[PDB]
Nucleic acid binder design. Structure first.
Ligand SMILES: [Mg+2]
Ligand SMILES: [Mg+2]
Ligand SMILES: [Mg+2]
Ligand SMILES: [Mg+2]
Ligand SMILES: [Mg+2]
Ligand SMILES: [Mg+2]
Ligand SMILES: [Mg+2]
Ligand SMILES: [Mg+2]
Ligand SMILES: [Mg+2]
Ligand SMILES: [Mg+2]
Ligand SMILES: [Mg+2]
Ligand SMILES: [Mg+2]
Ligand SMILES: [Mg+2]
Ligand SMILES: [Mg+2]
Ligand SMILES: [Mg+2]
Ligand SMILES: [Mg+2]
Ligand SMILES: [Mg+2]
Ligand SMILES: [Mg+2]
Ligand SMILES: [Mg+2]
Ligand SMILES: [Mg+2]
Ligand SMILES: [Mg+2]
Ligand SMILES: [Mg+2]
Ligand SMILES: [Mg+2]
Ligand SMILES: [Mg+2]
Ligand SMILES: [Mg+2]
Ligand SMILES: [Mg+2]
Ligand SMILES: [Mg+2]
Ligand SMILES: [Mg+2]
Ligand SMILES: [Mg+2]
Ligand SMILES: [Mg+2]
Length: 174
RNA sequence: UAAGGGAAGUCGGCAAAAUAGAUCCGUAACUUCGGGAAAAGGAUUGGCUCUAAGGGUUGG
RNA sequence: UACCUGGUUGAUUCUGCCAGUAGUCAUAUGCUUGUCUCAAAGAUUAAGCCAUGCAUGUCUAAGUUUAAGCAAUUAAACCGCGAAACUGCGAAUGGCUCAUUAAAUCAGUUAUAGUUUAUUUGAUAGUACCUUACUACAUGGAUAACCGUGGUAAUUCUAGAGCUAAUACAUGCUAAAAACCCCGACUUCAGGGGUGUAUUUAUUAGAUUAAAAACCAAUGCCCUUCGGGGCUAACUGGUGAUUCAUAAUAACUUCUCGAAUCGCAUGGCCUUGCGCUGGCGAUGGUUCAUUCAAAUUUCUGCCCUAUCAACUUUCGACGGCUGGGUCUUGGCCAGCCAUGGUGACAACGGGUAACGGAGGGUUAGGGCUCGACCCCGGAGAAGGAGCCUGAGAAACGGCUACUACAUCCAAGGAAGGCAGCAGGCGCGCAAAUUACCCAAUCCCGACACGGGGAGGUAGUGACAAUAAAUACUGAUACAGGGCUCUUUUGGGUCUUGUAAUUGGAAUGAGUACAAUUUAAAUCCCUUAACGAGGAACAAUUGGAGGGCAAGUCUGGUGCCAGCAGCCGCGGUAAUUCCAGCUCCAAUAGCGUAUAUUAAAGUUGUUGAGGUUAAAAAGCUCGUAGUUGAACCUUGGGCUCGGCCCGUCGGUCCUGGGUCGGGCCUUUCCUGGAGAACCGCAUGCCCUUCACUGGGUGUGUCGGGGAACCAGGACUUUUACCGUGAACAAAUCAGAUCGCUCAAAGAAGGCCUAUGCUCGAAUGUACUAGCAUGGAAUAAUAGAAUAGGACG
RNA sequence: CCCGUUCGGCACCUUACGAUAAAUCAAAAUGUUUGGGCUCCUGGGGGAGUAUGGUCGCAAGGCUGAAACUUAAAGAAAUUG
RNA sequence: AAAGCUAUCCAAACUCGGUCAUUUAGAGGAAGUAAAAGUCGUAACAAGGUCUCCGUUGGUGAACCAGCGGAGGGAUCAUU
RNA sequence: UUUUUUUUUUUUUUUUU
């Protein structure tokens, strides 16, 4: 069977716009990202919700299609944490910005919760198996943490921090 | 009249051979549009027994 | 997310193209390449040629066993396993490719009342019918396997000779009794023959439209208070529609089927006879229905081309009739007759580097383009044709013949079809191992057991896609931005950088005990002891004048070499070449070439342009086509209801607007099964003008207007719009679930457990077809020689 | 011959509520606020109205009518020299 | 009941012509395009020194010239 | 209103309060 697969980013329409290049570099440095692709990734996803939210606003308020689809969109937004309970219904979705979707990343939250003291150290720890969510170890910095899950981040029980067992370097100096 | 070859004969296919009636089919370049044209090239053809069509005259 | 920029000029506004830009599930190629998940992959050209190996076989108690086979069995009488062979079934599935093919395939929608059907499923068959020497307590003859004798160089070649089985082949009796038609000696009224199903022919039934009196022609029958009455009966299926379903009669047949088959359990009865009976199954069998289907078939819809305008018809072209052939209809074919059929609304012919579609890419809307290829349909197996077996084939891992190619040879002969899976050659810009296995998905077989290059697994694999390493950090010294002061003792220690100055912790790339995965392995996942200080475990691809982010740097060359998609650079001061340094863009990726899309309002229906930039025929007539003046029921009123816009909030009723319904204003019957109006049997209020305690479903007088069934009559017809039914999955949009997130997938979650549960949604069917409503808009008819309407 | 009205013509003069890139236009207006009806033609410049096929003509020629290849401009109206 | 045989039918294949479609060789001839410091003239752009252009015909090394008819895209929007 | 032909290739400009 032909297995479905898709793309998570788009190359910008104009390759060498000075304003666009500078704005992207603001997000890369602030959040300690890797390249421009995962910046384009978040913008593509953010466009998807914004495109979907706008197309429903064109319908009728009483129209059942808008009611079901609109509430479905908000539930993911509220659950993820980019949106609050007081943001009804969809006019506040259009105010979402690329920055807002970026704090919900595990790289940012591990830093905003004081686990790491620099955003570059924060990403390194996650990818290096030193951060777990609940009972689950997560090593993907793009892991989007929900508000419910935001209260269950701590170091891994196998890591020298939290677990206590010395690592390879500390054992070597013995 | 001649086996096999088929112009190697000869200045040269000279001489001979080959084709040939009728019916049906098919017919090129070129053209002064009239022709070429029977172009080229094919098929049938006997005997016997039948069948059908194609007329006239006189009385409606 | 409805978008532009550079380039004609000394400068300007345009027409207009070129270039730049981005996407592609779109191919190739260059450089580079650490990890995880998923994964395309000899289509383009040569449907070209193929060495070799494999890809289709199959046994249950339940078809046939004397293996001189095993295993325990009895002298014997034959079974527990089980080979060979006969028998049955399958081999017509699957897999591969896209050569042919343009009303053809195909798609949606129709029909088979014009047909066949192995298998599955449910039913389903009583027949004195007539042949053998006869039998039903049971018929006959062959042939394998086997023993032995060979042939040829050679084949999955076979002969001669001796046996021997059937669920292989061929025969063959039947069940009583009822009822019906025919023949019938017998004074005016016994007996014998035939009657299952299958086939063919012929005939009959298979009904039903409102009622009554006369010579009957024919017996009129019964009831006869001997007038007169009833009566040759009662019942009778289905479809919109049939000569249908079905029944009956007269016959017919190279006379089908109606069990001479196998296993388990073995039990009952009395006339004790090796007597009569008893289930479950297996296989098989006629008809009907059903299933998988197949085959034709109705309507509508296909790219370019007029430098294709007429095509078909001698020898079928359009049709009618009779017959043949077919499973069946049909010019499908054979005979006879007639002259038709298609076309400017594009027939016929030609091209396709054309299999059709679901769909892929890209788009605000309208579109453009691709679709060999994981799914459905079609066709093919080197190129044509023919055919056997078979339910099913015009089969090719079947046969026969011809052409091409090709193999062995003792030269007499024999044998062949990779567009099946690997592999090779050739071809090309262009595409992988002559690996492992049926464990998973399913299929086939006599079948729980065997087989499956279908299929899965692994290897090659920068097709494409997802996640994501190449580093983290403290202090010291310095600088900057602040803060109270400017006595500038300024770092004093809030922050950020430079720290070429140092100390630290952590880990995976790799590696490997062990565990895990798997048919067995690999990898991922898990994890002992290993594995990091730059020299290491070292990221690349393009560029730095503009479009377009980034150099006023240095050396070399000197219109040379060279660069440059375009404009342009280079002639001894090159921001463009060759290099060093520095920087910019993307980053495990980047560049290049070709195809296509947007940009392109540069194909314009939406939506281009035609005085001068390309473009109004020299002018007029005119056919096809396209388009075409106005005009026919409007207005008003009576109302009734839904929804929306306000205050009333009943628990923790109100006006207006819109929409719809019936009536007035010149505006369907038959039987009504229930409806109903006119009064209702009761009932209801009322002028003081008849008292009351009853009765749901209703009968009749009667029924202007109505949904109900079912028969018929009267409806102008098309276009258009609304609604409804039906309308493969997959794809797309889209709902849910922490595969560690993601691409994905259809999972999962809860309880400690005992086992408990939600899901696996929803939308999408343009055009053509079906049903109904709407009656403006666009067409067409109607009464004029009235051959007009009305009882 | 004079004055005026009207229909139908050949044109002209001023103006822009409009149009066009502009020159200019009572049509080249009523068009991004884009749909009255019909026909024909054009898609950067060349090659080229050429080659070939067809057809008409006595001929000269007419009508129909490409492609390979090549090129970053060709061209229109105005401006200052 | 095998071989064989009679007559139709389906019909491969080959030969011989015809037609369509698509490629391809060719002496020679006549064009186009491109490349530049080649020879000869100077036809056009000003009244380009004979105003330019169109159709047709004839001629000439070459651009071109001339006759007939037309146009202004003219060097005249005008003479009472 | 006598006539007056020709001129070898390339080279001829940028930013803001
Ligand atoms: Mg001689
Ligand atoms: Mg557009
Ligand atoms: Mg120009
Ligand atoms: Mg310039
Ligand atoms: Mg382009
Ligand atoms: Mg198949
Ligand atoms: Mg049955
Ligand atoms: Mg006929
Ligand atoms: Mg017939
Ligand atoms: Mg093809
Ligand atoms: Mg092909
Ligand atoms: Mg055959
Ligand atoms: Mg192969
Ligand atoms: Mg550079
Ligand atoms: Mg640039
Ligand atoms: Mg810039
Ligand atoms: Mg245009
Ligand atoms: Mg011109
Ligand atoms: Mg012009
Ligand atoms: Mg004119
Ligand atoms: Mg009309
Ligand atoms: Mg006039
Ligand atoms: Mg164009
Ligand atoms: Mg052109
Ligand atoms: Mg000019
Ligand atoms: Mg002049
Ligand atoms: Mg001029
Ligand atoms: Mg000069
Ligand atoms: Mg000169
Ligand atoms: Mg000169």
């Amino acid at each position: 069977a032909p297995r479905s697969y898709s793309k998570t980013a788009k190359v910008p329409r104009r390759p060498f716009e000075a304003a666009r290049l500078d704005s992207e570099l603001k997000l890369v440095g602030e959040y300690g990202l890797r390249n421009k692709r995962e910046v384009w990734r978040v913008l593509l996803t953010l466009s998807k919700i914004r495109r979907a939210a706008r197309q429903l606003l064109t319908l009728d308020e009483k129209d059942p299609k808008r009611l079901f689809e609109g509430n479905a969109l908000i539930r993911r937004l509220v659950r993820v944490g980019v949106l609050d309970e007081s943001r009804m219904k969809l006019d506040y979705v259009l105010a979402l910005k690329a920055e807002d979707f970026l704090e919900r990343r595990l790289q940012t939250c591990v830093y905003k919760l004081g686990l790491a003291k620099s955003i570059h150290h924060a990403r390194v720890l996650i990818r290096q198996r030193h951060i777990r969510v609940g009972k689950q170890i997560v090593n993907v910095p793009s892991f989007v943490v929900r508000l419910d899950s935001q209260k269950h981040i701590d170091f891994a029980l196998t890591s020298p921090f939290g677990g206590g067992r010395p690592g390879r370097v500390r054992r070597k100096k013995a």
